Amino acid sequence: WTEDCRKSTYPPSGPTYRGAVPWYTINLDLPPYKRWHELMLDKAPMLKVIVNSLKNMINTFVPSGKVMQVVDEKLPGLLGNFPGPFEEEMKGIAAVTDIPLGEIISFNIFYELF
Amino acid sequence: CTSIVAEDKKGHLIHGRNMDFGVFLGWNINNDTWVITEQLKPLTVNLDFQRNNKTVFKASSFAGYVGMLTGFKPGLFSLTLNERFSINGGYLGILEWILGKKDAMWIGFLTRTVLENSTSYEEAKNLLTKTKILAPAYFILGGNQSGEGCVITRDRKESLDVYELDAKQGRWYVVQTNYDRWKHPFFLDDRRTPAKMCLNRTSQENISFETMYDVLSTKPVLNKLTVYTTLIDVTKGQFETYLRDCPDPCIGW
Numbered sequence: 034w035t036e037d038c039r040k041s042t043y044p045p046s047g048p049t050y051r052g053a054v055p056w057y058t059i060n061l062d063l064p065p066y067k068r069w070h071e072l073m074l075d076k077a078p079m080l081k082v083i084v085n086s087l088k089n090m091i092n093t094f095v096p097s098g099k100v101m102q103v104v105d106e107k108l109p110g111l112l113g114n115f116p117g118p119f120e121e122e123m124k125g126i127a128a129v130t131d132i133p134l135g136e137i138i139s140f141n142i143f144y145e146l147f
Numbered sequence: 148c149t150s151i152v153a154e155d156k157k158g159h160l161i162h163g164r165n166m167d168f169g170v171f172l173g174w175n176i177n178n179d180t181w182v183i184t185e186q187l188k189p190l191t192v193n194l195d196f197q198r199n200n201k202t203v204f205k206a207s208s209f210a211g212y213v214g215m216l217t218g219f220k221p222g223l224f225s226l227t228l229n230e231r232f233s234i235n236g237g238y239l240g241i242l243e244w245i246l247g248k249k250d251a252m253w254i255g256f257l258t259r260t261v262l263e264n265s266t267s268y269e270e271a272k273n274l275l276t277k278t279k280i281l282a283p284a285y286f287i288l289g290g291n292q293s294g295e296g297c298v299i300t301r302d303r304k305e306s307l308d309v310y311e312l313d314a315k316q317g318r319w320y321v322v323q324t325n326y327d328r329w330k331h332p333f334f335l336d337d338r339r340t341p342a343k344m345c346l347n348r349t350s351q352e353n354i355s356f357e358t359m360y361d362v363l364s365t366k367p368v369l370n371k372l373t374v375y376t377t378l379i380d381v382t383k384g385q386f387e388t389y390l391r392d393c394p395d396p397c398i399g400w
Protein backbone atom coordinates (compact mmCIF):
# COMPACT_ATOMS: atom_id res chain seq x y z
CA TRP A 34 0.00 0.00 0.00
CA THR A 35 0.86 3.43 -1.00
CA GLU A 36 -0.40 6.86 -0.21
CA ASP A 37 -1.65 9.66 -2.42
CA CYS A 38 1.31 11.64 -3.75
CA ARG A 39 1.84 14.57 -1.40
CA LYS A 40 1.27 18.19 -2.38
CA SER A 41 2.77 21.45 -1.10
CA THR A 42 5.29 19.97 1.36
CA TYR A 43 8.13 22.42 0.61
CA PRO A 44 9.48 24.49 2.34
CA PRO A 45 9.47 21.82 5.06
CA SER A 46 6.88 22.18 7.82
CA GLY A 47 4.55 20.03 9.89
CA PRO A 48 4.98 16.70 11.70
CA THR A 49 6.93 15.46 8.66
CA TYR A 50 9.91 17.69 9.47
CA ARG A 51 11.95 17.28 12.66
CA GLY A 52 14.19 20.25 11.93
CA ALA A 53 16.98 21.78 9.93
CA VAL A 54 20.46 20.38 10.21
CA PRO A 55 23.49 22.46 11.08
CA TRP A 56 26.47 23.27 8.89
CA TYR A 57 30.06 22.64 9.92
CA THR A 58 33.07 23.68 7.84
CA ILE A 59 35.86 21.09 7.52
CA ASN A 60 39.16 22.64 6.45
CA LEU A 61 41.12 20.14 4.36
CA ASP A 62 44.21 22.36 4.68
CA LEU A 63 44.45 21.15 8.28
CA PRO A 64 46.18 17.78 8.71
CA PRO A 65 43.72 14.85 8.77
CA TYR A 66 44.22 14.27 12.52
CA LYS A 67 42.83 17.74 13.37
CA ARG A 68 40.07 18.00 10.74
CA TRP A 69 37.23 16.65 12.90
CA HIS A 70 38.30 18.19 16.23
CA GLU A 71 35.71 20.98 16.25
CA LEU A 72 32.86 18.72 15.13
CA MET A 73 33.65 15.85 17.50
CA LEU A 74 33.91 18.12 20.55
CA ASP A 75 30.26 19.07 19.97
CA LYS A 76 28.98 15.62 18.92
CA ALA A 77 30.90 13.16 21.15
CA PRO A 78 28.01 12.61 23.62
CA MET A 79 25.55 11.65 20.88
CA LEU A 80 27.85 9.07 19.29
CA LYS A 81 28.53 7.63 22.75
CA VAL A 82 24.79 6.96 23.01
CA ILE A 83 24.91 4.82 19.86
CA VAL A 84 27.82 2.69 21.10
CA ASN A 85 25.86 2.08 24.31
CA SER A 86 22.76 1.07 22.35
CA LEU A 87 25.05 -1.05 20.16
CA LYS A 88 26.31 -2.87 23.26
CA ASN A 89 22.79 -3.82 24.37
CA MET A 90 21.88 -5.62 21.13
CA ILE A 91 25.22 -7.45 21.20
CA ASN A 92 24.60 -8.39 24.83
CA THR A 93 21.43 -10.32 23.94
CA PHE A 94 23.55 -12.86 22.01
CA VAL A 95 27.05 -13.00 23.57
CA PRO A 96 28.19 -10.86 26.54
CA SER A 97 29.17 -7.38 25.43
CA GLY A 98 32.29 -6.63 27.47
CA LYS A 99 34.15 -9.66 26.10
CA VAL A 100 32.95 -8.65 22.62
CA MET A 101 34.17 -5.08 22.96
CA GLN A 102 37.60 -6.05 24.32
CA VAL A 103 38.22 -7.92 21.07
CA VAL A 104 36.96 -5.10 18.83
CA ASP A 105 39.11 -2.56 20.65
CA GLU A 106 42.24 -4.64 21.31
CA LYS A 107 42.38 -6.92 18.25
CA LEU A 108 40.34 -5.43 15.38
CA PRO A 109 42.54 -2.36 14.58
CA GLY A 110 45.54 -4.61 14.02
CA LEU A 111 43.43 -7.24 12.28
CA LEU A 112 42.33 -4.77 9.59
CA GLY A 113 45.73 -3.10 9.28
CA ASN A 114 46.16 0.56 8.44
CA PHE A 115 43.54 2.22 6.27
CA PRO A 116 44.69 4.20 3.22
CA GLY A 117 45.21 7.92 2.91
CA PRO A 118 43.53 10.43 5.21
CA PHE A 119 41.24 7.92 6.90
CA GLU A 120 43.64 6.28 9.37
CA GLU A 121 44.52 9.72 10.74
CA GLU A 122 40.97 11.09 10.45
CA MET A 123 39.62 8.16 12.46
CA LYS A 124 42.54 8.32 14.91
CA GLY A 125 41.71 11.97 15.53
CA ILE A 126 38.02 11.23 16.08
CA ALA A 127 38.93 8.41 18.46
CA ALA A 128 41.08 10.69 20.62
CA VAL A 129 38.79 13.74 20.76
CA THR A 130 35.71 11.66 21.67
CA ASP A 131 37.54 9.28 24.08
CA ILE A 132 36.13 6.41 22.03
CA PRO A 133 38.38 3.42 21.29
CA LEU A 134 39.77 3.20 17.78
CA GLY A 135 38.17 -0.17 17.04
CA GLU A 136 34.70 1.28 17.64
CA ILE A 137 35.37 4.35 15.50
CA ILE A 138 36.48 1.94 12.77
CA SER A 139 33.42 -0.29 13.26
CA PHE A 140 31.24 2.80 12.82
CA ASN A 141 33.05 3.75 9.61
CA ILE A 142 32.94 0.29 7.99
CA PHE A 143 29.35 -0.42 9.02
CA TYR A 144 28.27 -0.65 5.37
CA GLU A 145 30.62 -3.56 4.66
CA LEU A 146 29.52 -5.14 7.95
CA PHE A 147 25.84 -4.56 7.05
CA CYS B 148 17.18 4.63 0.69
CA THR B 149 15.74 6.29 -2.37
CA SER B 150 17.78 8.30 -4.87
CA ILE B 151 16.34 10.27 -7.79
CA VAL B 152 18.03 12.25 -10.58
CA ALA B 153 15.41 14.16 -12.58
CA GLU B 154 15.63 16.54 -15.53
CA ASP B 155 13.09 19.30 -16.12
CA LYS B 156 11.92 20.43 -19.55
CA LYS B 157 14.82 22.90 -19.82
CA GLY B 158 17.55 20.36 -19.04
CA HIS B 159 17.99 21.34 -15.38
CA LEU B 160 19.05 18.52 -13.07
CA ILE B 161 17.49 17.93 -9.64
CA HIS B 162 19.06 15.27 -7.39
CA GLY B 163 17.03 14.18 -4.38
CA ARG B 164 17.45 11.35 -1.92
CA ASN B 165 16.10 9.87 1.30
CA MET B 166 18.48 8.24 3.79
CA ASP B 167 16.84 5.19 5.37
CA PHE B 168 18.92 3.43 8.01
CA GLY B 169 18.55 1.93 11.44
CA VAL B 170 16.87 -1.48 11.47
CA PHE B 171 19.85 -3.12 13.14
CA LEU B 172 19.44 -2.00 16.76
CA GLY B 173 15.78 -2.95 16.96
CA TRP B 174 12.53 -1.15 17.59
CA ASN B 175 11.33 1.42 20.14
CA ILE B 176 7.95 -0.02 21.12
CA ASN B 177 7.14 3.04 23.24
CA ASN B 178 6.94 5.62 20.42
CA ASP B 179 7.11 3.41 17.28
CA THR B 180 10.61 4.19 16.00
CA TRP B 181 13.87 2.44 15.17
CA VAL B 182 16.57 2.77 17.83
CA ILE B 183 19.38 3.77 15.46
CA THR B 184 17.25 5.98 13.19
CA GLU B 185 16.30 8.22 16.11
CA GLN B 186 19.91 8.24 17.32
CA LEU B 187 21.25 9.22 13.88
CA LYS B 188 19.08 12.33 13.50
CA PRO B 189 20.89 14.42 16.17
CA LEU B 190 24.16 13.10 14.71
CA THR B 191 23.37 14.26 11.16
CA VAL B 192 25.48 17.25 10.12
CA ASN B 193 26.17 19.30 7.01
CA LEU B 194 29.80 19.68 5.97
CA ASP B 195 31.42 22.40 3.85
CA PHE B 196 34.76 20.87 2.88
CA GLN B 197 37.06 23.78 2.03
CA ARG B 198 40.53 24.23 0.57
CA ASN B 199 41.93 27.79 0.58
CA ASN B 200 38.66 29.15 2.03
CA LYS B 201 36.98 27.76 -1.11
CA THR B 202 34.39 24.99 -1.10
CA VAL B 203 35.71 21.74 -2.55
CA PHE B 204 32.55 19.74 -1.86
CA LYS B 205 29.56 19.81 0.49
CA ALA B 206 27.98 16.79 2.12
CA SER B 207 25.49 15.35 4.58
CA SER B 208 27.06 12.83 6.95
CA PHE B 209 26.75 11.33 10.40
CA ALA B 210 29.23 12.85 12.84
CA GLY B 211 32.27 10.63 13.35
CA TYR B 212 31.86 8.78 10.03
CA VAL B 213 34.48 10.01 7.58
CA GLY B 214 33.04 8.44 4.43
CA MET B 215 30.51 10.29 2.29
CA LEU B 216 27.02 8.96 1.55
CA THR B 217 25.46 12.19 0.23
CA GLY B 218 27.26 15.11 -1.38
CA PHE B 219 28.03 17.17 -4.44
CA LYS B 220 30.73 19.33 -5.96
CA PRO B 221 29.06 22.69 -6.72
CA GLY B 222 28.59 23.10 -10.46
CA LEU B 223 30.21 19.72 -11.15
CA PHE B 224 28.37 16.56 -10.09
CA SER B 225 26.26 15.04 -7.31
CA LEU B 226 26.60 11.61 -5.72
CA THR B 227 24.37 9.62 -3.37
CA LEU B 228 24.96 5.98 -2.42
CA ASN B 229 22.31 3.31 -1.88
CA GLU B 230 22.85 0.01 -0.10
CA ARG B 231 22.89 -3.14 -2.23
CA PHE B 232 22.27 -6.61 -0.81
CA SER B 233 24.18 -9.70 -1.88
CA ILE B 234 24.90 -13.31 -0.94
CA ASN B 235 27.90 -12.66 1.32
CA GLY B 236 28.09 -8.88 0.95
CA GLY B 237 31.23 -7.30 2.29
CA TYR B 238 32.31 -10.43 4.11
CA LEU B 239 34.48 -11.98 1.40
CA GLY B 240 35.67 -8.49 0.59
CA ILE B 241 36.58 -7.97 4.24
CA LEU B 242 38.22 -11.41 4.43
CA GLU B 243 40.38 -10.76 1.36
CA TRP B 244 41.44 -7.44 2.89
CA ILE B 245 42.58 -9.01 6.18
CA LEU B 246 44.47 -11.85 4.48
CA GLY B 247 46.36 -9.23 2.49
CA LYS B 248 44.58 -8.23 -0.74
CA LYS B 249 44.04 -4.48 -0.28
CA ASP B 250 43.50 -3.58 -3.97
CA ALA B 251 39.89 -2.54 -3.21
CA MET B 252 38.38 0.51 -1.53
CA TRP B 253 35.85 0.68 1.28
CA ILE B 254 32.45 1.90 0.14
CA GLY B 255 32.22 5.05 2.25
CA PHE B 256 35.83 5.93 1.45
CA LEU B 257 35.51 5.71 -2.34
CA THR B 258 32.59 8.14 -2.58
CA ARG B 259 34.62 10.28 -0.17
CA THR B 260 37.59 10.11 -2.54
CA VAL B 261 35.35 10.83 -5.54
CA LEU B 262 33.66 13.84 -3.94
CA GLU B 263 36.93 15.27 -2.62
CA ASN B 264 39.19 14.66 -5.61
CA SER B 265 37.29 13.91 -8.82
CA THR B 266 36.96 16.86 -11.18
CA SER B 267 34.13 16.02 -13.60
CA TYR B 268 30.99 13.94 -13.97
CA GLU B 269 32.75 11.63 -16.44
CA GLU B 270 35.73 11.21 -14.09
CA ALA B 271 33.43 10.43 -11.16
CA LYS B 272 31.42 8.07 -13.37
CA ASN B 273 34.51 6.17 -14.55
CA LEU B 274 35.83 5.72 -11.01
CA LEU B 275 32.54 4.55 -9.56
CA THR B 276 32.04 2.18 -12.51
CA LYS B 277 35.41 0.39 -12.41
CA THR B 278 36.93 0.68 -8.91
CA LYS B 279 37.14 -2.56 -6.94
CA ILE B 280 35.08 -2.47 -3.75
CA LEU B 281 34.62 -4.73 -0.74
CA ALA B 282 30.80 -4.85 -0.93
CA PRO B 283 28.11 -4.27 -3.57
CA ALA B 284 26.41 -0.89 -3.76
CA TYR B 285 24.32 1.49 -5.84
CA PHE B 286 25.96 4.70 -7.06
CA ILE B 287 23.46 7.37 -8.13
CA LEU B 288 25.29 10.16 -9.92
CA GLY B 289 24.12 13.29 -11.72
CA GLY B 290 26.13 15.92 -13.60
CA ASN B 291 25.89 19.58 -14.59
CA GLN B 292 24.70 19.31 -18.21
CA SER B 293 21.50 17.78 -19.53
CA GLY B 294 21.24 14.00 -19.72
CA GLU B 295 24.12 13.52 -17.26
CA GLY B 296 22.48 11.24 -14.71
CA CYS B 297 22.82 7.52 -14.09
CA VAL B 298 22.49 4.66 -11.61
CA ILE B 299 25.52 2.36 -11.43
CA THR B 300 24.63 -1.08 -10.07
CA ARG B 301 27.86 -2.51 -8.66
CA ASP B 302 29.20 -5.93 -7.86
CA ARG B 303 32.40 -6.06 -5.81
CA LYS B 304 34.61 -6.32 -8.92
CA GLU B 305 32.27 -5.46 -11.82
CA SER B 306 29.68 -2.94 -12.99
CA LEU B 307 26.53 -4.99 -13.59
CA ASP B 308 24.64 -2.15 -15.30
CA VAL B 309 24.58 1.63 -15.76
CA TYR B 310 21.09 3.11 -16.23
CA GLU B 311 21.41 6.55 -17.82
CA LEU B 312 18.99 9.36 -18.61
CA ASP B 313 17.47 9.60 -22.08
CA ALA B 314 15.02 12.51 -22.42
CA LYS B 315 14.71 12.04 -26.20
CA GLN B 316 13.18 8.60 -25.55
CA GLY B 317 11.13 10.04 -22.69
CA ARG B 318 13.28 9.03 -19.76
CA TRP B 319 13.68 12.16 -17.66
CA TYR B 320 14.40 10.56 -14.27
CA VAL B 321 16.29 7.62 -12.79
CA VAL B 322 15.04 5.96 -9.59
CA GLN B 323 16.92 3.52 -7.39
CA THR B 324 15.98 2.03 -4.03
CA ASN B 325 17.68 -1.16 -2.81
CA TYR B 326 16.92 -3.72 -5.56
CA ASP B 327 18.25 -4.37 -9.03
CA ARG B 328 16.25 -2.50 -11.65
CA TRP B 329 15.72 -5.59 -13.83
CA LYS B 330 14.77 -7.69 -10.81
CA HIS B 331 11.69 -7.25 -8.73
CA PRO B 332 11.60 -5.51 -5.38
CA PHE B 333 10.91 -7.55 -2.31
CA PHE B 334 7.10 -7.87 -2.02
CA LEU B 335 6.99 -6.16 1.35
CA ASP B 336 9.26 -3.29 0.40
CA ASP B 337 8.40 -1.66 -2.91
CA ARG B 338 9.23 2.04 -2.79
CA ARG B 339 10.40 2.21 -6.39
CA THR B 340 6.88 1.96 -7.83
CA PRO B 341 5.28 4.73 -5.69
CA ALA B 342 8.35 6.88 -6.35
CA LYS B 343 7.68 6.52 -10.08
CA MET B 344 3.93 7.13 -9.91
CA CYS B 345 4.58 10.28 -7.96
CA LEU B 346 7.24 11.39 -10.42
CA ASN B 347 4.94 10.50 -13.30
CA ARG B 348 1.99 12.41 -11.85
CA THR B 349 4.24 15.41 -11.13
CA SER B 350 5.30 15.55 -14.84
CA GLN B 351 8.65 16.48 -16.36
CA GLU B 352 7.72 20.19 -16.57
CA ASN B 353 6.86 20.51 -12.90
CA ILE B 354 9.86 18.67 -11.46
CA SER B 355 11.69 20.95 -9.03
CA PHE B 356 12.98 21.17 -5.46
CA GLU B 357 9.39 21.43 -4.24
CA THR B 358 7.95 18.54 -6.25
CA MET B 359 11.06 16.43 -5.59
CA TYR B 360 10.56 16.93 -1.85
CA ASP B 361 6.91 16.02 -2.46
CA VAL B 362 7.68 12.53 -3.78
CA LEU B 363 10.24 11.89 -1.02
CA SER B 364 7.55 12.76 1.54
CA THR B 365 5.00 10.26 0.19
CA LYS B 366 4.75 7.00 2.08
CA PRO B 367 6.39 4.56 1.79
CA VAL B 368 9.22 6.57 0.17
CA LEU B 369 9.05 8.37 3.50
CA ASN B 370 9.09 5.76 6.26
CA LYS B 371 10.21 5.18 9.84
CA LEU B 372 13.79 4.54 8.67
CA THR B 373 14.06 7.90 6.85
CA VAL B 374 16.69 9.87 8.77
CA TYR B 375 16.97 12.81 6.37
CA THR B 376 15.96 14.10 2.93
CA THR B 377 18.49 15.86 0.69
CA LEU B 378 17.62 17.91 -2.39
CA ILE B 379 20.60 18.88 -4.55
CA ASP B 380 20.98 21.36 -7.41
CA VAL B 381 24.48 21.14 -8.88
CA THR B 382 24.20 24.09 -11.29
CA LYS B 383 22.58 26.44 -8.75
CA GLY B 384 24.92 25.33 -5.95
CA GLN B 385 21.96 24.63 -3.65
CA PHE B 386 22.27 21.79 -1.14
CA GLU B 387 19.51 21.35 1.46
CA THR B 388 18.90 18.39 3.75
CA TYR B 389 16.09 18.06 6.29
CA LEU B 390 15.55 15.77 9.25
CA ARG B 391 12.40 13.70 8.84
CA ASP B 392 9.78 12.00 10.97
CA CYS B 393 7.03 9.59 9.98
CA PRO B 394 4.24 9.86 12.56
CA ASP B 395 1.80 7.01 12.99
CA PRO B 396 0.26 5.84 10.77
CA CYS B 397 3.38 5.02 8.73
CA ILE B 398 5.14 1.93 7.39
CA GLY B 399 8.31 0.78 9.10
CA TRP B 400 10.67 0.24 6.16
Ligand SMILES: *[C@@H]1O[C@H](CO)[C@@H](O[C@@H]2O[C@H](CO)[C@@H](O[C@@H]3O[C@H](CO)[C@@H](O)[C@H](O)[C@H]3NC(C)=O)[C@H](O)[C@H]2NC(C)=O)[C@H](O)[C@H]1NC(C)=O
Pocket residue numbers: 078079082175178180182185186188189392
Ligand atom coordinates in the same frame (compact mmCIF):
# COMPACT_ATOMS: atom_id res chain seq x y z
C1 LIG C 1 11.50 7.70 20.92
O1 LIG C 1 12.12 7.47 22.21
C2 LIG C 1 13.56 7.51 22.20
C3 LIG C 1 14.01 7.20 23.61
O2 LIG C 1 13.13 7.74 24.58
C4 LIG C 1 14.05 8.87 21.70
O3 LIG C 1 15.47 8.86 21.59
C5 LIG C 1 16.14 10.01 22.17
O4 LIG C 1 16.22 11.16 21.31
C6 LIG C 1 16.91 12.27 21.90
C7 LIG C 1 16.80 13.42 20.92
O5 LIG C 1 16.63 12.96 19.59
C8 LIG C 1 18.36 11.90 22.23
O6 LIG C 1 18.96 13.02 22.89
C9 LIG C 1 20.34 12.95 23.35
O7 LIG C 1 20.37 12.11 24.53
C10 LIG C 1 21.68 11.86 25.06
C11 LIG C 1 21.50 10.92 26.22
O8 LIG C 1 21.41 11.62 27.45
C12 LIG C 1 22.34 13.18 25.46
O9 LIG C 1 23.66 12.92 25.93
C13 LIG C 1 22.38 14.13 24.27
O10 LIG C 1 22.93 15.38 24.66
C14 LIG C 1 20.98 14.32 23.68
N1 LIG C 1 20.96 15.24 22.54
C15 LIG C 1 22.01 15.75 21.86
C16 LIG C 1 21.65 16.69 20.75
O11 LIG C 1 23.18 15.47 22.10
C17 LIG C 1 18.39 10.63 23.08
O12 LIG C 1 19.72 10.12 23.19
C18 LIG C 1 17.54 9.52 22.48
N2 LIG C 1 17.50 8.37 23.37
C19 LIG C 1 17.84 7.14 22.99
C20 LIG C 1 17.75 6.07 24.04
O13 LIG C 1 18.21 6.89 21.84
C21 LIG C 1 13.46 9.14 20.32
O14 LIG C 1 13.85 10.42 19.86
C22 LIG C 1 11.94 9.06 20.37
N3 LIG C 1 11.36 9.32 19.06
C23 LIG C 1 10.18 9.90 18.88
C24 LIG C 1 9.75 10.10 17.46
O15 LIG C 1 9.47 10.24 19.83
Ligand SMILES: *[C@@H]1O[C@H](CO)[C@@H](O[C@@H]2O[C@H](CO)[C@@H](O)[C@H](O)[C@H]2NC(C)=O)[C@H](O)[C@H]1NC(C)=O
Pocket residue numbers: 117118259260263264
Ligand atom coordinates in the same frame (compact mmCIF):
# COMPACT_ATOMS: atom_id res chain seq x y z
C1 LIG D 1 42.94 13.60 -2.71
O1 LIG D 1 44.13 13.70 -3.44
C2 LIG D 1 45.17 14.39 -2.73
C3 LIG D 1 46.34 14.48 -3.68
O2 LIG D 1 46.29 13.45 -4.66
C4 LIG D 1 45.51 13.65 -1.43
O3 LIG D 1 46.35 14.52 -0.68
C5 LIG D 1 47.49 13.86 -0.13
O4 LIG D 1 47.13 12.81 0.77
C6 LIG D 1 48.24 12.14 1.38
C7 LIG D 1 47.65 11.06 2.26
O5 LIG D 1 46.62 11.59 3.09
C8 LIG D 1 49.10 13.13 2.16
O6 LIG D 1 50.27 12.46 2.63
C9 LIG D 1 49.50 14.31 1.28
O7 LIG D 1 50.16 15.30 2.06
C10 LIG D 1 48.27 14.93 0.63
N1 LIG D 1 48.64 16.02 -0.25
C11 LIG D 1 47.88 17.10 -0.43
C12 LIG D 1 48.41 18.14 -1.36
O8 LIG D 1 46.80 17.24 0.15
C13 LIG D 1 44.26 13.34 -0.62
O9 LIG D 1 44.59 12.43 0.43
C14 LIG D 1 43.16 12.74 -1.48
N2 LIG D 1 41.93 12.59 -0.71
C15 LIG D 1 41.31 11.42 -0.54
C16 LIG D 1 40.06 11.46 0.29
O10 LIG D 1 41.74 10.38 -1.03
Ligand SMILES: *[C@@H]1O[C@H](CO)[C@@H](O)[C@H](O)[C@H]1NC(C)=O
Pocket residue numbers: 222223266267268269291292
Ligand atom coordinates in the same frame (compact mmCIF):
# COMPACT_ATOMS: atom_id res chain seq x y z
C1 LIG E 1 30.41 21.18 -16.11
O1 LIG E 1 31.36 20.11 -15.92
C2 LIG E 1 32.44 20.12 -16.87
C3 LIG E 1 33.28 18.90 -16.58
O2 LIG E 1 32.58 17.70 -16.87
C4 LIG E 1 33.23 21.43 -16.76
O3 LIG E 1 34.24 21.45 -17.76
C5 LIG E 1 32.30 22.62 -16.94
O4 LIG E 1 33.01 23.83 -16.71
C6 LIG E 1 31.12 22.53 -15.96
N1 LIG E 1 30.21 23.65 -16.14
C7 LIG E 1 29.54 23.91 -17.27
C8 LIG E 1 28.65 25.11 -17.24
O5 LIG E 1 29.65 23.21 -18.28
Ligand SMILES: *C(=O)NCCCCCC
Pocket residue numbers: 143144148149166167168216228229230324325
Ligand atom coordinates in the same frame (compact mmCIF):
# COMPACT_ATOMS: atom_id res chain seq x y z
C1 LIG F 1 20.35 3.50 1.73
O1 LIG F 1 19.66 2.91 1.03
N1 LIG F 1 21.26 2.59 2.32
C2 LIG F 1 21.91 3.59 3.05
C3 LIG F 1 23.23 3.73 3.77
C4 LIG F 1 23.87 2.72 4.66
C5 LIG F 1 24.57 3.60 5.68
C6 LIG F 1 25.82 2.92 6.20
C7 LIG F 1 26.31 3.53 7.51
